[PDB]
């Protein structure tokens, strides 16, 4: 599958490995993504930090 970066204009492919994927958040605004790849397996979120994982094309 294909997952975009922060900026949905540029997106890659999800690397070795990785194959979903997954869009982290920042207490900053969880509203806006702060980073966006692809991963394996599903991150666990945080107060800190979110993690929305998609088996979707282009999702995050």
Request: hydrophobic share 30%; net charge positive; proline share 9%.
């Given at each position: 599958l294909?997952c975009?970066?922060?900026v949905?204009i540029?997106?890659?492919?999800c690397?070795?490995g990785k194959?979903l994927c997954?869009?982290?958040?920042?207490?900053?605004?969880?509203?806006?993504?702060?980073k966006?790849?692809c991963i394996?397996?599903?991150?666990?979120?945080?107060?800190?930090?979110?993690?929305?994982?998609c088996?979707?094309?282009r999702?995050?």
């Open positions: 294909k975009n970066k922060l949905p540029a997106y890659k492919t690397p070795e194959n997954y869009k982290m958040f920042m207490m900053s605004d969880l509203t806006i993504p702060v966006r790849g394996d397996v599903c991150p666990k979120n945080s107060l800190l930090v979110k993690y929305v994982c088996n979707t094309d999702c995050n």
